[PDB]
């Protein structure tokens, strides 16, 4: 089974997630009561312990807890589709909005979008929609096109191209890509969080990937710390599901920091 708050792979587990795992296994298997701090570590460290270490920490259930973890590793749980759907929209909005602010593309070519929906409606950019099979109710504002690099590598050179879960043979250089040799023109997109929303004072967040105005001095406000952690869960939930993010090579996070001056 699964408790719906341990659905990600154990490598993504936090210290509190491990405590929930011990408490969940205490009732699911009628194990003897065990203190939460018996395994005071994150999931990334719990995977480095030996089975002998489990017995030393928990003489009554250490061997049972170890074998339970192995089956979790051998058979990863499936994430909820709606939560994965929400995670994909949140990451898509974050990445595209940041890219448009960083490099100020005059036009966006959304390739693979059959519903003519902008993920960044306030972007102030010419939004173009392309799809091989446009929806009937949106085809009037969608160009019917099947993208192939051998056919269109000389097209859509202006602005940026968006291939969000649009698996094509090879992406052009000016691309923003999510996918579940084709990325030779691109680079991997590292994790980051960007927010231009106002700060509000009502655990201190230490991270160089929190691109917020309050983090210029290292003091992330409560509002952006909570939004950062909610986004990180969505990012991890999407990476755990087998999605990878790729971007044009000149993408630079320092362009996002310059938006605060
Ligand atoms: N292979 C391939 C191709 C598949 N698509 C379209 O991309 C979509 C993938 S599902 C929706 C993805 C959307 N960007 C979203 O963010 O939800 C479908 O509508 C499919 O018809 C294509 N379109 C243009 N040229 C192609 N070469 C393909
Ligand atoms: Zn802030």
3D structure, described in words:
It is classed as viral protein. The entry lists the keywords viral, SARS-CoV-2, covid-19, methyltransferase, RNA cap, inhibitor, SS148, viral protein. It forms a monomeric assembly. The entry is titled "Crystal structure of SARS-CoV-2 nsp14 methyltransferase domain in complex with the SS148 inhibitor". This protein is of the alpha/beta class and 261 residues long. It has 2 domains: 10-74, Transcription Factor, Ets-1 (DNA polymerase, domain 1), CATH 1.10.150.50; 81-260, no CATH class. Helices cover 34% and strands 14% of the residues. The chain has 8 helices and 9 strands. It has helices at 15-28, 43-46, 51-57, 62-74, 81-103, 149-152, 222-240, 254-257; strands spanning 107-111, 126-131, 143-144, 160-164, 175-179, 186-188, 193-195, 210-212, 244-248. The chain has a 7-stranded mixed sheet with strand order 3-2-1-4-5-9-6, with helices on one face. It has a two-stranded parallel sheet with strand order 7-8. Helix 3 (51-57) crosses helix 4 and helix 5 (81-103) crosses helix 7 (222-240). It is globular and about 65 Å long. Residues 199, 212-214, 220-221, 223-224 line the site of zinc ion.
**Tally of alpha and pi helices:** 8
Which small molecules are bound? Answer: ligand 6NR, zinc ion
Helix and strand composition category: alpha/beta
Number of E-state strands: 9
What is the end-to-end distance? Answer: 50 Å
Please summarize what this structure is:
The protein is α/β, with parallel strands linked by helices. 34% of the residues lie in helices and 14% in strands.
